Amino acid sequence: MTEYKLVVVGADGVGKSALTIQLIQNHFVDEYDPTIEDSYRKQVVIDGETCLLDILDTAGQEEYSAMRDQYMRTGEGFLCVFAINNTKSFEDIHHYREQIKRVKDSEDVPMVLVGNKSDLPSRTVDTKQAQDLARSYGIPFIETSAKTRQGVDDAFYTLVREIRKHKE
Numbered sequence: 001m002t003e004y005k006l007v008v009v010g011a012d013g014v015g016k017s018a019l020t021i022q023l024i025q026n027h028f029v030d031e032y033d034p035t036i037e038d039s040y041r042k043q044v045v046i047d048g049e050t051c052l053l054d055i056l057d058t059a060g061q062e063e064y065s066a067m068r069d070q071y072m073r074t075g076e077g078f079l080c081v082f083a084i085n086n087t088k089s090f091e092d093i094h095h096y097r098e099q100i101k102r103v104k105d106s107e108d109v110p111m112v113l114v115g116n117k118s119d120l121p122s123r124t125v126d127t128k129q130a131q132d133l134a135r136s137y138g139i140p141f142i143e144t145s146a147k148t149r150q151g152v153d154d155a156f157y158t159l160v161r162e163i164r165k166h167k168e
């Protein structure tokens with residue numbers, strides 16, 4: 001069965017775990033879920049083909065050891081997540097993309113820009129800002145709510161379709 005190794009990255013508190021848990025377990029994150037780094041797995045059907053998603057929900061310390069670089073190099077595609085009410089999380093996106101490009105030694109890595117928490121009303125990053133940044137990188141922008149499930153499948157499946165083609 002075809003396996004896709006997806007990696008979810010972004011600032012503290014943006015909803016990396018919530019997006020992953022919603023995709024895999026069909027509900028929202030809570031006070032009992034893992035806050036150490038962990039991986040999830042689920043067999044799904046995308047465009048009529050069965051495949052297995054292996055999702056790395058990142059956590060822990062920021063560090064640039066050879067081991068950490070090499071480990072991240074193994075991810076096949078990245079969701080770069082910010083929260084639409086957290087401008088600093090959005091301004092950090094360039095940092096995550098820079099590290100992905102550095103370890104993959106390539107500008108052509110499957111990636112999706114995810115603006116999470118779209119259910120909130122108090123938005124401080126507007127859609128045009130996020131679209132502009134996504135267009136500057138040549139990556140899709142998908143607005144999500146891990147709480148209501150809006151956009152969640154589209155975000156992960158878009159990343160899969162990018163990897164699937166990139167492998168062909």
Ligand SMILES: CCN(c1nc(OC[C@@]23CCCN2C[C@H](F)C3)nc2c(F)c(-c3ccc(F)c4sc(N)c(C#N)c34)c(C(F)(F)F)cc12)[C@H]1CCN(C(=O)OC)C1
Nearest residue numbers: 009011012058059060061062063064068069072099100103
């Ligand atoms: C989980 C750890 N984490 C991470 N924080 C940061 O930066 C946090 C901020 C705020 C402080 C100063 N620093 C710089 C900037 F200002 C933003 N960068 C991270 C990062 F670049 C990666 C990464 C991604 C893709 C890759 F190819 C590689 S390769 C490699 N060696 C990586 C590393 N490390 C890495 C990862 C990883 F690996 F999990 F995906 C996690 C990162 C937490 C630390 C506390 N955090 C926070 O938001 O505090 C406010 C977030």
Ligand SMILES: Nc1nc2c(ncn2[C@@H]2O[C@H](COP(=O)(O)OP(=O)(O)NP(=O)(O)O)[C@@H](O)[C@H]2O)c(=O)[nH]1
Nearest residue numbers: 011012013014015016017018029059117145146147
């Ligand atoms: N309103 C709203 N809150 C969300 C959403 N996703 C996550 N949150 C909230 O944001 C906080 C962090 O969510 P979590 O998924 O743990 O974020 P994380 O990016 O995994 N944080 P960490 O880097 O510490 O592991 C929690 O209070 C959670 O309820 C969302 O779509 N909508």
Ligand SMILES: [Mg+2]
Nearest residue numbers: 011012013035
């Ligand atoms: Mg945290």
Ligand SMILES: [Mg+2]
Nearest residue numbers: 016017035059
């Ligand atoms: Mg988390």
